[PDB]
Symmetry: D3
């Protein structure tokens, strides 16, 4: 009942699909699938929940990666084994630039590699760059729904707290390497923090797979720390609409 | 009073009822299994890869919370549990052994980990040892002897990937980056017992923040003998390891 | 002069914000001549500067010389003078078997095998091209009808060992670069050149727009010696693409 | 002589598998005098070796000297002669306020601020002590009755800048080690010494058992100059522990 | 027409020359060659201008490298292919020590490797050290003409601005790695900044080629930043005389 | 005692600014006997110090022990006492086929395969010897008539794996040092030793003058086990050079 080690899927479950939308959150999988025609649940194992749906009369996979590069690396690899060639990540994000507001959508051209898993596919000098066609389709899709969009570099961290220079922690300390890091990234024009893009973009770009990255701004780190409960859902829906519309252009 | 005191786990400090020890499996589906071994098991929360149950061990509240696969999610789980008052962490996992003398069904207690991860660096520079707490290690080894098991104590390679970082070539690309080509043979020669995916992060982040951490895993595959685990030995080995981690939790209360 | 090396003042640029930046100083006149009202401005060391006009708007052409260090000087001083958009036109050796001599390559991002990029951002920062610039080049290549490949470029501080050439005085390559071409090939890296890592890193980390295009004059998997006819044809072919892309970014 | 430096043969050991390894060559005679039948074997360079008997079994005491390089020579050459267990006895400077002068510290693993450890295993490999050896040292400390702390040790390749001492000739510390003592302090690192990182890495990566114990003769958060009496008392206190631990490991 | 890819020279052009003076400025080539016997233009391609001359009856090459290790590495390699075994660099420099004045001559024993190209010949732990016979000849030549000489370590940077900790720039920022780096080098006894020596000295010392390095101080970083034009040419003339005199001793 | 380890006062030195620093503590008497008025000062741990007179001027001889760590302690504490010039005399294993046993090697700079040098300057800083010291050593070698080679030395933090010795307990060499000897050989590195990188880095970055001279007792390309008598005469040859060089520097 499975051709892969973790996902619990066969090549036949995919029905010829070559594109997958890959959110971090397993609870978001159904929401993205519901936007497309005839969505069905295929599998749920660990943090990997998979749905299949129809878009413009063509099968599309939605599969969760979980938080971080390691589980992303498993999901992407096993989906690649199953036949997926195009990967579109839909994420949540904390912006670090003052001109970016909550509700804005960010398209990532390339990522700052603050992760470990990217190194298991390519040395640090290799750019965690997004596929040009995927990035184009995400930019086009953002205009299609009519959102406020920023395009640029993302800092992709193996941690939510110290690697994003959060001090509201148990220890209250940040290791020397990351002390003052946010200010450095800010000055370099880095838009935001998330936790999967570096791994995803590196492993795909170094293995002949197409990858795109899009995220909804939940919090801006220069104005607030605790997100709003209602705005969180609206921003998520906005970006989910874009990732589906982008997939339409890449079929 | 409350609904959630942390960003991800969906738990309040009040939910924990004074608990200071947590058992941290990778698989969210393993949480109920561990909690079923103790008294009064109750489901607290399920969000993302983080499933949390509360149980009673010798009259003392204990938490079971899944980390998910890998350092990044593990770092969120551990930090947010520490915010809620957890001081002791015991990881129970699955693992592939790389030494010929270690058989499937054996139990491995980790003294310290080879840091093939990225998250550990976010707490301490690479030179800092990813070392388990001595009292936690003692308890796990003592628990393994108590219920009876084939035990090996030593070093674990903790990788940020399942595939290339553990030198698996049966993949889509069929290639392994230069840095990891020939790496398994090197760890083997250095006496490293096994591969898993969370210990380097867990052990580094706890040892560098005044928290106690222990690491135990049941070997379900030996890399010199096979690649695919048996879907029965898997269940028995997990049951074996789950019994050991609860018994080690008893000694640390 | 307003700057240390270029021998240019702010007035010389006449409000220009876009520069085409070849490596070869002899290419500067060739690029300028394709545009309206081409005028020489200055020549000091490897930095030759011309000013021209594209659709009524002033544009700068300025040579960087070979390598990140002189590129970093040229880009920094042009930025000081008001340039915000940088389009590099270069020559390259392809390392993929499917890429032909005469093909044009558009760089999305570069493998940083250089030193100068590190003086602007740590290695983990991507040497990524600006999205608008890359789009302009891809559209400009599609307009003239060239065979175009889009992807990653290996940018080396060295022509020989860093590109794993063994036809050298020593005949040796340092451990770090031994087998490196094979690695890049497997990773889908299209080609080797010598300036893009520095240019892309320094621009992306300072709020400057940069694009990178190159004509293939050699494929490393078939032959090493470039033909003394295709070289001029490929250069002029890629020069037309960069000028047309500049038209879209004004 | 079967070895390059120590000046010992396989027969000189008489089947010994355990060795106590102090840094100070003047401490070898002190440790061996506490065991039955002490015999001087060889003294070459900084390596002094004494043979003793513990519970009717031959035990070796051999000085490593200060630092990883000679520790690597000593351990390797003793291993060639049949030694499978290494117990290090040293002095240390504590960096935690709750640890006092006179206290005994058992090292679980070490921060690798050394070079020699890299010659055996890459930095990511933990400089971790053998679990059985650590157990014995902790149990031996409880046996004699002493205030014991168990945890991490910073093992520096230098006495001054690597341990962030500013009372030096230059009065400066290199950028890399600036503010490093506070970093280790916040990370719960107990102390500074100069041999454990090399010893623990080279043993754990070669199937050899290694244990590490030290007496606190200075506390870095209060006073720099140690007392010329309490030093000897602490040294003699720690020696009793390492001999008692050696009994449990034979 | 050419035996090499860039320089535009054949072996015959060199006429058996084994020594080359290598300035950074292509315009310095004729000026250096004019101080010797029978000066002749050989080639000019890109930043590489080559002249041939005679010194005590022996053919000597003068060839420009351009700014930085990359073009230096090309020139030196191709000169080596054509038969050059001894390389003497004469350049300009900015001193970072208060006791070194404008107009002073500096002879480099070894260089701090703040470049990329040196790594393409030897790992960072390999010393960017000058040849003993070349260093001796330069020190002896400087004392022979009567100049204020300083011998020691040079910081060799792939960048003129941030890597030499200049803040008078478009961004006005310096990356963390190089923040406070000048003060570190100053305290370590480093004399000066230039842009080619690390590459030249590393590539020669690891390939069995002799290399020496000499430079004229035109700016002191602890004092003024704007150099005098008349003083610049005079300082260049002083250093050019020393390097030709040093070449005499090495033939 | 004004120092922590050496057990020496500023008055014990009698205003000496130069010190010859061997690795072996038994060689300290040998060098001191070559000069006028040999007097023993102190012997603690691996550090033995002897005072002598050269040309009517006081000169110190102090053992560093094997490796960077104790070398850094010795050199720092001697600098505190007033020593500004450090001349190292050691033994070495040559890795070039043209260098024979009995030859003398003067080190211009060292490959930094140590850890202690990093505690004074980052890896990019060259472990370079002082020009005057190097000049004095070369001139002294020609004065007494010895077969001399001048160049780069590999300075390792270990005797075995870092010098790619496979005749060990494990018989393995870590990936980093696998094939490393061949690399150094192609790069023209003359030899292996264990102190120069630390000595040359810590001195060149602190304003202290340092020189390095060594006697070839083995060549790695031919055989491993050296002759006994040849080892003694090579030591005496090198010691004669370092004393003659010290005469020029005072
Ligand atoms: O600041 C952030 N950093 C991130 O890495 N991120 C991506 O999702 C990571 C797991 O929530 C999302 C945000 Se936004 C946020 C702020 C506070 C609480 C939850 C999410
Ligand atoms: O080889 C391993 N490496 C690991 O890192 N590991 C830990 O669990 C990671 C998620 O399955 C578990 C094993 Se065992 C095994 C082999 C093949 C398929 C599943 C599990
Ligand atoms: O293989 C190459 N690598 C490059 O870095 N490159 C860019 O121009 C660098 C200066 O010629 C150009 C080529 Se193509 C070539 C092959 C042989 C001779 C000259 C150019
Ligand atoms: O602070 C220390 N750091 C160490 O590395 N250490 C171990 O012994 C190394 C040789 O003295 C011992 C001490 Se304690 C001490 C303080 C002052 C003088 C000698 C020892
Ligand atoms: O500070 C310096 N750093 C250098 O690397 N340098 C060498 O020439 C590099 C190209 O100008 C020369 C100087 Se001096 C100087 C100061 C200001 C403007 C031009 C030259
Ligand atoms: O190969 C060598 N490597 C070295 O680092 N070296 C310097 O002395 C180190 C301590 O003996 C000396 C030699 Se030569 C020698 C060969 C065999 C046994 C002793 C010395
Ligand atoms: K995860
Ligand atoms: K020593
Ligand atoms: K150049």
């Amino acid at each position: 009942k499975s051709d892969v080690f973790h996902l619990g899927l066969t090549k036949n479950d995919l029905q010829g699909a070559t594109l997958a939308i890959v959110p971090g959150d397993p609870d978001r999988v159904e929401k993205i699938a519901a936007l497309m025609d005839k969505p069905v649940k295929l599998a749920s194992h660990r943090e990997f929940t998979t749905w299949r749906a129809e878009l413009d009369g063509k099968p599309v996979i939605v599969c969760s990666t979980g938080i971080g590069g390691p589980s992303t690396s498993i999901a992407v690899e096993e989906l690649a084994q199953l036949g997926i060639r195009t990967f579109l990540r839909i994420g949540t994000t904390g912006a670090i630039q003052p001109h970016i507001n909550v509700g804005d959508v960010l398209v990532t051209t390339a990522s700052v590699r603050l992760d470990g898993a990217s190194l298991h596919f390519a040395p640090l000098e290799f750019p965690a760059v997004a596929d040009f066609e995927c990035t184009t389709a995400l930019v086009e899709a953002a205009k299609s729904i009519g959102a406020t969009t920023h395009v640029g570099v993302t800092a992709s961290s193996d941690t939510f707290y110290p690697g994003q220079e959060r001090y509201d922690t148990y220890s209250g300390r940040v290791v020397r390497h990351f002390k003052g890091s946010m200010e450095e990234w800010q000055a370099m024009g880095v838009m935001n923090y998330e936790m999967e893009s570096a791994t995803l973009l590196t492993m795909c770009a170094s293995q002949g797979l197409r990858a795109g990255m899009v995220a909804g701004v939940i919090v801006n780190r220069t104005q607030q720390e605790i997100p709003n409960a209602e705005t969180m859902k609206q921003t998520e829906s906005h970006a989910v609409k874009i990732v589906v519309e982008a997939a339409r252009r890449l079929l």
